Amino acid sequence: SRKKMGLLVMACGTPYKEEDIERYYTHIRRGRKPEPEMLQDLKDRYEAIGGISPLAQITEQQAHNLEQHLNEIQDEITFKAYIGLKHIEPFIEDAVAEMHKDGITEAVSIVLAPHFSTFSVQSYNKRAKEEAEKLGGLTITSVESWYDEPKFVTYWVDRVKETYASMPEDERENAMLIVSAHSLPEKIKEFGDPYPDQLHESAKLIAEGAGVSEYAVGWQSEGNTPDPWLGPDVQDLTRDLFEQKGYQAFVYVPVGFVADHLEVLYDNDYECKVVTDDIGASYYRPEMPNAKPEFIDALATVVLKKLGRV
Ligand SMILES: *Cc1c(C)c(=O)n2c(=O)c(C)c(C)n12
Numbered sequence: 001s002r003k004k005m006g007l008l009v010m011a012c013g014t015p016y017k018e019e020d021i022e023r024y025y026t027h028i029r030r031g032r033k034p035e036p037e038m039l040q041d042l043k044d045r046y047e048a049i050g051g052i053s054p055l056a057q058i059t060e061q062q063a064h065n066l067e068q069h070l071n072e073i074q075d076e077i078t079f080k081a082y083i084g085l086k087h088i089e090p091f092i093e094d095a096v097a098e099m100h101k102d103g104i105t106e107a108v109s110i111v112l113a114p115h116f117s118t119f120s121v122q123s124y125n126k127r128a129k130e131e132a133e134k135l136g137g138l139t140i141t142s143v144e145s146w147y148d149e150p151k152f153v154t155y156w157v158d159r160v161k162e163t164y165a166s167m168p169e170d171e172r173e174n175a176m177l178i179v180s181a182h183s184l185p186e187k188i189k190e191f192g193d194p195y196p197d198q199l200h201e202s203a204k205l206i207a208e209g210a211g212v213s214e215y216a217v218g219w220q221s222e223g224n225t226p227d228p229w230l231g232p233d234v235q236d237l238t239r240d241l242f243e244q245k246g247y248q249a250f251v252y253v254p255v256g257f258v259a260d261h262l263e264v265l266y267d268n269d270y271e272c273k274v275v276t277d278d279i280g281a282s283y284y285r286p287e288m289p290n291a292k293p294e295f296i297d298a299l300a301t302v303v304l305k306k307l308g309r310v
């Protein structure tokens, strides 16, 4: 008989249909409903990148593929996946309550974002643990970061190598690699938040494995509050590096994101591409991990290492 464990997979969440945009963004904006022009802009952006519902399905597929792969590659534990989201149902607390109702007493959790921060990962883990404590009789051990898992580094190294090999000769000799994650308010530094250092380490490990000597670290998708957010933003960084040294190709690796999403398909493949098109450079942005088997195997290894079983 195998031990049963819950597998709590946590993520930001996505609207499921266009009519969910209002409530999703109201939640992100801490109760402030977007004005009508912004609502219309957001709908247009989702239409421009091919629609909402495919983006919403990816998290579901990642959690289910991870459950099935973990159950196939070892014989001691039977995992059952539960999805808990920050900004739309099923919420984190809903998922923990469901695990408790179903009779789970032991769970492991992972956030679908490879870098730890106080703003995101630590808050998701704290919310899950506090719900478990309120209900009693259920314990959660939480993955905090996994950007340094070799199988995850290798996913991106191989995609970068393929992109550079695909380039014409003069591009390959005059290209710049930009490695990025979602910006956060700068005030996280008051806590010693390692998020910026972990993004810089991801960039070092990917550029090193791919043999790319010219690379830079940037941030993207900052929200709107009066206090400053981490920078430079990818759009400004691209133009600055072009003005400095005249690169003919820019390769974007938004390593902080794990799936196709508005903040990649729009904030890179539209907003960064506007800049590259303006300066006359080529744009490349390799495939996101999504639910591909190589990435699922990386996540399964993260989980089993956290449990001491590999
Ligand atoms: C929704 C979302 C994703 C995918 C992400 O990485 N982040 C952040 O870092 C914030 C603050 C939010 C919201 N999201």
Ligand SMILES: [Cl-]
Pocket (backbone or CB within 6 Å): 121, 122, 125, 126, 142, 144
């Ligand atoms: Cl934590």
Ligand SMILES: [Cl-]
Pocket (backbone or CB within 6 Å): 142, 143, 144, 145, 306
């Ligand atoms: Cl960890």
Ligand SMILES: [Cl-]
Pocket (backbone or CB within 6 Å): 116, 144, 145
């Ligand atoms: Cl960490």
Ligand SMILES: [Cu+2]
Pocket (backbone or CB within 6 Å): 060, 064
């Ligand atoms: Cu499901």
Ligand SMILES: [Cu+2]
Pocket (backbone or CB within 6 Å): 068, 069, 070, 072
């Ligand atoms: Cu498998």
Ligand SMILES: [Cu+2]
Pocket (backbone or CB within 6 Å): 200, 217
């Ligand atoms: Cu830097």
Ligand SMILES: [Cu+2]
Pocket (backbone or CB within 6 Å): 182, 221, 222, 223, 263
């Ligand atoms: Cu965002």
Ligand SMILES: [Mg+2]
Pocket (backbone or CB within 6 Å): 018, 019
């Ligand atoms: Mg409709």
Ligand SMILES: [Mg+2]
Pocket (backbone or CB within 6 Å): 145, 146
């Ligand atoms: Mg670690």
Ligand SMILES: [Mg+2]
Pocket (backbone or CB within 6 Å): 221, 222, 267
């Ligand atoms: Mg923006």
